[PDB]
Design a protein around this motif. Structure first.
Motif, PDB file in Angstrom:
ATOM      1  N   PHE A  51       0.860  -1.181   0.000  1.00 19.97           N
ATOM      2  CA  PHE A  51       0.000   0.000   0.000  1.00 19.97           C
ATOM      3  C   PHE A  51       0.894   1.227   0.000  1.00 19.97           C
ATOM      4  CE2 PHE A  51      -3.967  -2.029   2.182  1.00 19.97           C
ATOM      5  CZ  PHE A  51      -3.931  -3.052   1.260  1.00 19.97           C
ATOM      6  N   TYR A  53       1.732   5.420  -0.671  1.00 17.43           N
ATOM      7  CA  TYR A  53       1.055   6.641  -0.248  1.00 17.43           C
ATOM      8  C   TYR A  53       0.349   7.236  -1.460  1.00 17.43           C
ATOM      9  CZ  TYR A  53       0.283  10.415   3.086  1.00 17.43           C
ATOM     10  OH  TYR A  53      -0.277  11.298   3.979  1.00 17.43           O
ATOM     11  N   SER A  56      -4.503  10.056  -4.294  1.00 16.59           N
ATOM     12  CA  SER A  56      -5.941  10.068  -4.536  1.00 16.59           C
ATOM     13  C   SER A  56      -6.703   9.315  -3.452  1.00 16.59           C
ATOM     14  CB  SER A  56      -6.249   9.475  -5.912  1.00 16.59           C
ATOM     15  OG  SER A  56      -6.362   8.065  -5.846  1.00 16.59           O
ATOM     16  N   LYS A  57      -5.989   8.728  -2.489  1.00 15.90           N
ATOM     17  CA  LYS A  57      -6.594   8.023  -1.357  1.00 15.90           C
ATOM     18  C   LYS A  57      -5.978   8.592  -0.085  1.00 15.90           C
ATOM     19  N   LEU A  58      -6.780   9.324   0.698  1.00 14.32           N
ATOM     20  CA  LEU A  58      -6.178  10.144   1.738  1.00 14.32           C
ATOM     21  C   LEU A  58      -6.690   9.741   3.127  1.00 14.32           C
ATOM     22  N   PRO A  59      -5.946  10.085   4.204  1.00 15.60           N
ATOM     23  CA  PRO A  59      -6.227   9.486   5.516  1.00 15.60           C
ATOM     24  C   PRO A  59      -7.304  10.191   6.326  1.00 15.60           C
ATOM     25  CG  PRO A  59      -4.289  10.835   5.683  1.00 15.60           C
ATOM     26  CD  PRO A  59      -4.721  10.906   4.241  1.00 15.60           C
ATOM     27  N   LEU A  60      -7.617   9.621   7.487  1.00 11.77           N
ATOM     28  CA  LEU A  60      -8.475  10.226   8.496  1.00 11.77           C
ATOM     29  C   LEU A  60      -7.618  10.841   9.598  1.00 11.77           C
ATOM     30  N   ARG A  61      -8.269  11.597  10.487  1.00 11.25           N
ATOM     31  CA  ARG A  61      -7.567  12.235  11.598  1.00 11.25           C
ATOM     32  C   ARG A  61      -8.530  12.668  12.698  1.00 11.25           C
TER      33      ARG A  61
ATOM     34  N   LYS B  75      -3.196   2.502   5.883  1.00  8.28           N
ATOM     35  CA  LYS B  75      -2.004   2.850   6.645  1.00  8.28           C
ATOM     36  C   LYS B  75      -2.449   3.363   8.009  1.00  8.28           C
ATOM     37  CE  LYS B  75       0.825   4.044   2.720  1.00  8.28           C
ATOM     38  NZ  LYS B  75       2.276   3.859   2.451  1.00  8.28           N
ATOM     39  N   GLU B  94       1.592  -0.207   7.635  1.00  3.84           N
ATOM     40  CA  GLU B  94       0.847  -0.474   6.420  1.00  3.84           C
ATOM     41  C   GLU B  94       0.068  -1.756   6.668  1.00  3.84           C
ATOM     42  OE1 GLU B  94       2.107  -2.503   2.101  1.00  3.84           O
ATOM     43  OE2 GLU B  94       3.311  -0.899   2.995  1.00  3.84           O
ATOM     44  N   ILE B  95      -1.207  -1.615   7.013  1.00  5.42           N
ATOM     45  CA  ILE B  95      -2.021  -2.772   7.393  1.00  5.42           C
ATOM     46  C   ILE B  95      -2.563  -3.330   6.088  1.00  5.42           C
ATOM     47  CG2 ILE B  95      -3.820  -3.666   8.888  1.00  5.42           C
ATOM     48  CD1 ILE B  95      -1.346  -2.253  10.093  1.00  5.42           C
ATOM     49  N   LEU B 132      -2.565   8.898  11.800  1.00  8.39           N
ATOM     50  CA  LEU B 132      -3.149   9.066  10.468  1.00  8.39           C
ATOM     51  C   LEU B 132      -3.805   7.758  10.055  1.00  8.39           C
ATOM     52  CD1 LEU B 132      -0.860  11.462   8.514  1.00  8.39           C
ATOM     53  CD2 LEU B 132      -2.383  11.804  10.444  1.00  8.39           C
ATOM     54  N   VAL B 133      -5.120   7.827   9.865  1.00  7.92           N
ATOM     55  CA  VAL B 133      -5.934   6.658   9.543  1.00  7.92           C
ATOM     56  C   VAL B 133      -6.182   6.687   8.037  1.00  7.92           C
ATOM     57  CG1 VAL B 133      -7.981   5.379  10.077  1.00  7.92           C
ATOM     58  CG2 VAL B 133      -6.928   6.777  11.830  1.00  7.92           C
ATOM     59  N   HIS B 134      -5.294   6.040   7.288  1.00  6.37           N
ATOM     60  CA  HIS B 134      -5.414   5.983   5.838  1.00  6.37           C
ATOM     61  C   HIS B 134      -6.489   4.983   5.437  1.00  6.37           C
ATOM     62  CE1 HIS B 134      -2.493   8.616   3.984  1.00  6.37           C
ATOM     63  NE2 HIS B 134      -1.576   8.258   4.863  1.00  6.37           N
ATOM     64  N   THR B 135      -7.599   5.491   4.919  1.00  7.81           N
ATOM     65  CA  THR B 135      -8.724   4.672   4.500  1.00  7.81           C
ATOM     66  C   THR B 135      -8.710   4.468   2.989  1.00  7.81           C
ATOM     67  OG1 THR B 135     -10.076   6.677   4.498  1.00  7.81           O
ATOM     68  CG2 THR B 135     -10.188   5.258   6.439  1.00  7.81           C
ATOM     69  N   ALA B 138     -10.838   8.648   0.093  1.00  7.62           N
ATOM     70  CA  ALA B 138      -9.984   9.806   0.305  1.00  7.62           C
ATOM     71  C   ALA B 138     -10.734  10.929   1.015  1.00  7.62           C
ATOM     72  CB  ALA B 138      -9.441  10.319  -1.025  1.00  7.62           C
ATOM     73  N   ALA B 139      -9.960  11.889   1.525  1.00 11.18           N
ATOM     74  CA  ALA B 139     -10.458  13.142   2.084  1.00 11.18           C
ATOM     75  C   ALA B 139     -11.454  12.939   3.219  1.00 11.18           C
ATOM     76  CB  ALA B 139     -11.083  14.023   0.996  1.00 11.18           C
ATOM     77  N   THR B 140     -11.276  11.892   4.027  1.00 10.23           N
ATOM     78  CA  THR B 140     -12.102  11.620   5.207  1.00 10.23           C
ATOM     79  C   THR B 140     -13.584  11.513   4.839  1.00 10.23           C
ATOM     80  N   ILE B 146     -15.620   8.123  11.830  1.00  5.85           N
ATOM     81  CA  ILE B 146     -14.396   8.599  12.462  1.00  5.85           C
ATOM     82  C   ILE B 146     -14.686   9.441  13.704  1.00  5.85           C
ATOM     83  CG2 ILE B 146     -14.313  10.513  10.822  1.00  5.85           C
ATOM     84  CD1 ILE B 146     -11.318   8.846  12.610  1.00  5.85           C
ATOM     85  N   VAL B 162      -2.841  15.696   6.521  1.00  9.39           N
ATOM     86  CA  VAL B 162      -3.298  14.740   5.525  1.00  9.39           C
ATOM     87  C   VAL B 162      -2.135  14.153   4.733  1.00  9.39           C
ATOM     88  CG1 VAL B 162      -3.766  16.639   3.924  1.00  9.39           C
ATOM     89  CG2 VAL B 162      -4.856  14.406   3.549  1.00  9.39           C
TER      90      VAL B 162
END
Ligand SMILES: Nc1ncnc2c1ncn2[C@@H]1O[C@H](COP(=O)(O)OP(=O)(O)OP(O)(O)=S)[C@@H](O)[C@H]1O
Ligand SMILES: Nc1ncnc2c1ncn2[C@@H]1O[C@H](COP(=O)(O)OP(=O)(O)OP(O)(O)=S)[C@@H](O)[C@H]1O
Lengths: 69, 189, 398, 24, 127, 398, 127, 78
Positions: A51, A53, A56-61, B75, B94-95, B132-135, B138-140, B146, B162
């Motif tokens: 996986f 970085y 186009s696929k971005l994380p949560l917070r 991630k 990296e899960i 950082l919770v990579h789903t 994108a863009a939460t 969450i 981000v």
């Protein structure tokens, strides 16, 4: 020359090291000739992310901050 | 004859394993000195004495532990970072999940992250972490999953927290497993 | 003709094999005199490097072959599951020749000549193997069944076989393995998990077979438990145990039939309630019966000269074998009386299982005589009362 | 102090070519 | 310098033992004894065990008959399942690197005998 | 009519095919004249690139068919079917003749009707396939079922059919195939892990059928492991998953019915309590009983001939066969005396299964003969003794 | 001198293997001795002494114990050679001491199958 | 059962001690490693094993078949 220290308690000649105070291994040499021989050698496998970085696929917070010290 | 169903713990334990991990890493990454050496999971885990920080982790992770249980998480990243909220030490869990072996090889994990201080160069103290919770979205996407926690709120993928960069991965681990592809690796910068 | 000689080499002795062979051949040719066993020697080397020499069925012939063996000291290794290491398989693993097995082949006494048949069976197997016969054209399932009365030493004969074969066939296979299969720890019964468990232990058997320089004996106790009769049992309530655990062993054993350094040995109790498709896949199904009068007399002898050998019965009186009593023709005499009284005990102690026979001296020296040192004909009387004590005790438990 | 066995901290010697004696 | 490269091999052997979990007794803990950031053993029996194994290869290593220091991790049958092979062709930079190396080398990977047939540590492991 | 010839390529007989074809042609034109087997030739290319030439079912100046075939020394090549590498071996994979099944079709001896039927079945299958018959007006499920009392050899029949048909159809198809299904590695304790494994097996087989140049035989050794009766599973003991398996198997067998290069061989012993919805899904259900008198005679004759050739019986005698015995009108004389006495053994050996009839030439030399050589009438008597021993050993074991 | 002492240990070990027809007279160190012509044994004993050679370069040494085994490899005899290691008559005097030793004493079976040992000019025999 | 019996075996090899050893209410859970040790100490001699099993006829193959004399005690007396 090959130096087979059986131990750690729980052409080419062989300079094995006996160093006994137990007299009850009953097998240094075959295990010595076992430790000497090369066996199925797995090739050095390579590392890579699966996986990456993605831009186009971005994380949560989450919101809150840790107690500083 | 009794055929029978199963009771997976699959997606949740990870983050709470991260809990142990983070409680270890917050220690090892030198980003906690209020940490104490303790005993848990048959390893020399270094945890925190503050029950207040224990409940802070309860909020940060143990509130999202069934919310993190969506398998969309790519991630789980402990970004070890300065005041700018940008990594120096990307503990990228990296899960890569293919859905007691989990602690059988997290034995190596915890144990080697413990050894990572023999690999981690001297990271400056006074630098915190972000989870950082990579789903897969994108863009939460889906704020609800969450911000599940009522008292503990969540935020969208704002431009600061981000992104990351400087990905020099020395894969301190590559511990594939049955349920988990815990491709943990410490991407230095 | 041919005669066989076996000699115990000491573990702390490490002289080369051919020196041992030459020394024992020298002793034999110097002596060259029945089936007695040497224990006394006259050579410091041979003493510190030999324990005993024995002849196995008084002649100066020189048709002599030497088998030299080392009974392995340590006992059994254990076999557990690959990922369910707690208790799933738990099979016993003897690395023959083994210490706890010696003297066993001698002590057992039968009257149907099981020993010779069941030993020359394997001998002819090896003969047909070395001659390269068409295995597609003359074949054997390598499975031997033994069934009979409980406590009559049915399973004892299998360990004796394995010991005698890894001794006799030395220098043809460096050693032998003997895998004792627990047919009660492979019944984890929820929807054919036992029928899947047989597979793992049989793959381990395959692992121990492919080591083509080791003779392996697979000893299955209670072969009635693994193979329950599926056809005649009008019980559809048996979901998959009577059909998917017998069929999960009728294949793994037809798979090792191709190999040649494996022998299957099985011990059964119930002649019925066993799959008819397994009473065809066994070469020898030999019945081990309860001891008969002459056999009882011989076992009682073995016990009594054992006690005399350890000085329990201090005043050593010659115990006359039944052949000498037949020769004299049953004539009462001041020494011949004791053998006669033994023989009366033999008829009176008829029909008991060998295990209680090999117990009876224990009880007869337990309750009736407390003496640390006993004179004969009182100990014999103690036996003649303890046997009736056993009859009445059996009658007590209904 | 040291003994060698051309067959106390002992330095044995093996010479793998000769290795018939199963228990050395 | 080999009088401290032997202790570097000490570092190596115990860290392999440590990361492989060859025993559940968690004796190991961080030890900077004499300012060496390495994680040895707390058994002085075993510290001196590595010490005198390396002592008795000291008339034996720098004689340069060495063709590879094969630290085998043995097995239940005492089998070389993981021969951690180190080539004898010789300043902390290597040390952490070797440390690094070992760790990243255990990266792919999942009772030890020190046989002695760029410190290019490579692992001959069972497939 | 047509007579069939099989010519066997040795290991390094790489040269070509057409040259061998024409070479065997001029061989047959120089000979022109029961079944025979050539192994010794004269022309150097024949003697080097051919190991055997068998004429299997006179003036041969008629239609003649050749089948050049070369045996492949490959092995199991197991299909893991692993989901997370935790699964176990399933569907062992046999190939173009693997030299392990060689010579099988003629060692097995049945009645005449059991082989010709099972061959012209697959022949008419292709005849109908390539004449373009309507798919859904005359169709078949391409499944054969063999049942009989246990021990009568119904796995060898399927494997020998695979061998014989791979050789007999080397022109229409490039080469043969065979998948033996491990019917006990499909099940799993967990919920609906069984039907998914069954459909995974059959989709893998379907992948192996994708190419239309192979010929796939799928052998399910013992069906009742898989197609367990559906209603007979009585109250509570047998869960539902014992129904999903059966109907998934039935659906898959219907789904791979459309192809023309698949034949499914399935066997099970007298435990023919097969699910009716499967025991209808079968074109040929053939009965394989125990051998009859003539079959026993031929097995014994083959055993004795092989033994003489292998030099366990040194003095070779020319044993007659039934055809000449009926030709001479059973006249007693020195040449046929031993033949008639073997026949009298046969007439009294009626009843056993083939599984043991190919042991007795090994037992009668394992238990009643000591010298590693013996004359005929000195070995054939031990055959009668072993027959009687087997009968009694059966009888007293209930 | 250690080198020539090792060659005299050659003389010893093998002539004492003698002290039958597979042996032969030849000139060694300007005396005729009746040993074996075996080139394998010649170079094998040369190898024994030349592995004893670095041992004596250590200079720490007590005995060169040329154990004349029995056929059992379990000594019924022996020949300890306790030279306290720090003209032709004396280079032959040692050989005459051993000959008179085997004189008052006796030898072993023809193939003495001896295994030279060392414990790291005088001698005796533990019979 | 590992160190306790090494102490006991230190107490067995002497001819002077009549050591009897009690087992109460007859690795961990992938065998108990108690058998191999107790079975091997059975061999020393002058070490006699008593087991207060307190479990009725229902017994495992591990210890109840190597045990030779077996007596039953019922309700206590007046
Ligand atoms: N027929 C016999 N002759 C001499 N000794 C016997 C005989 N039968 C049994 N024994 C003794 O019985 C003891 C153990 O016999 P076992 O073989 O265990 O009986 P068993 O037949 O196993 O019964 P099962 O089937 O396991 S209940 C051995 O010590 C034998 O010496
Ligand atoms: N009619 C026969 N002719 C020759 N051999 C036979 C005959 N029947 C059986 N056999 C011998 O039987 C031996 C083994 O047959 P198997 O096929 O294993 O029997 P089988 O029917 O599998 O038994 P199952 O699987 O229990 S029905 C083969 O080698 C055959 O030779």
């Amino acid at each position: 020359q090959v130096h087979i220290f059986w131990g750690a308690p729980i052409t080419t000649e062989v300079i094995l090291h006996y160093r006994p105070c137990e007299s009850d291994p009953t097998q240094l040499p075959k295990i010595a000739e076992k430790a000497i021989q090369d066996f199925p050698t797995r090739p050095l496998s390579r590392f890579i992310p699966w996986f990456p970085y993605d831009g186009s696929k971005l994380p949560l917070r989450p919101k809150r901050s840790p107690p500083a010290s | 004859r009794q055929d029978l169903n199963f009771g997976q713990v699959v997606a949740d334990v990870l983050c709470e394993f991260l809990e142990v991990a983070v409680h270890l890493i917050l220690y090892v990454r030198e980003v906690y000195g209020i940490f104490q050496k303790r005993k848990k999971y048959n390893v020399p885990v270094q945890m925190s004495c503050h029950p207040e920080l224990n409940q802070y982790i309860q909020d940060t992770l143990h509130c999202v532990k069934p919310l993190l249980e969506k398998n969309d998480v790519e991630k789980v990243v402990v970004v070890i970072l300065d005041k700018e909220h940008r990594p120096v030490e990307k503990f990228v869990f990296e899960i890569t999940q293919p859905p007691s072996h989990v602690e059988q090889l997290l034995r190596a994990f915890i144990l080697k992250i413990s050894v990572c201080d023999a690999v981690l160069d001297h990271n400056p103290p006074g630098c915190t972490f972000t989870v950082l919770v990579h789903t897969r979205e994108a863009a939460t996407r889906n704020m609800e999953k969450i911000q599940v926690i009522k008292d503990f709120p969540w935020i969208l993928a704002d431009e600061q927290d981000v992104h990351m960069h400087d990905p020099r991965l020395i894969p301190l681990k590559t511990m594939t497993s049955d349920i988990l592809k815990m491709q943990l690796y410490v991407e230095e910068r | 003709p041919t005669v066989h000689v076996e000699v115990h080499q000491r573990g702390s002795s490490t002289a080369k094999k051919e020196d041992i062979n030459l020394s024992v051949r020298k002793l034999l040719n110097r002596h060259n005199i029945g089936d007695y066993t040497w224990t006394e020697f006259d050579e410091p080397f041979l003493t510190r490097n030999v324990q005993s020499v024995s002849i196995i069925d008084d002649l100066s012939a020189c048709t002599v072959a030497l088998h030299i063996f080392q009974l392995n000291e340590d006992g059994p290794s254990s076999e557990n599951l690959e990922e369910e290491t707690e208790n799933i398989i738990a099979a016993n693993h003897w690395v023959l020749p083994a210490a706890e097995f010696h003297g066993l082949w001698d002590s057992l006494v039968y009257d149907v000549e099981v020993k010779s048949h069941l030993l020359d069976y394997v001998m002819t197997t090896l003969l047909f193997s070395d001659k390269n016969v068409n295995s597609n054209l003359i074949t054997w399932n390598r499975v031997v069944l033994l069934h009979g009365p409980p406590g009559t030493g049915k399973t004892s004969l299998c360990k004796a076989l394995a010991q005698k074969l890894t001794i006799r066939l030395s220098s043809r296979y460096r050693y032998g393995q003997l895998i004792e299969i627990n047919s009660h720890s492979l019944f984890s019964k929820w929807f054919s998990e036992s029928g899947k468990l047989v597979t793992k232990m049989f793959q381990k058997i395959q692992d121990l077979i492919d080591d083509k320089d080791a003779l392996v004996f697979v000893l299955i106790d209670q072969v009635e438990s693994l193979t329950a009769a599926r056809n005649a049992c009008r019980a559809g309530t048996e979901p998959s145990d009577a059909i998917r655990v017998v069929n999960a062993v009728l294949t793994q054993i037809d798979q090792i039939k191709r190999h040649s350094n494996v022998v299957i040995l099985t011990t059964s109790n119930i002649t019925e309630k066993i799959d008819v498709a397994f009473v065809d896949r066994a070469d020898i199904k030999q019945y081990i019966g309860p001891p008969s009068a002459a056999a009882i007399f011989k076992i009682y002898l073995s016990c009594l000269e054992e006690l005399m050998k350890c000085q329990i019965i201090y005043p050593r009186q010659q115990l006359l074998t039944l052949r000498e009593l037949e020769m004299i023709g049953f004539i009462e005499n001041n020494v011949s009386k004791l053998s006669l009284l033994l023989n009366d005990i033999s008829r009176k102690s008829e029909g008991l299982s060998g295990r209680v026979l090999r117990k009876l001296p224990f009880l007869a020296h337990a309750l009736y005589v407390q003496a640390p040192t006993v004179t004969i004909e009182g100990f014999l009387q103690a036996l003649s009362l303890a046997v009736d004590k056993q009859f009445e005790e059996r009658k007590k438990l209904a | 102090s040291q003994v060698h066995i051309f067959w106390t901290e002992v330095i044995l010697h093996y010479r793998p070519c000769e290795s018939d004696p199963t228990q050395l």
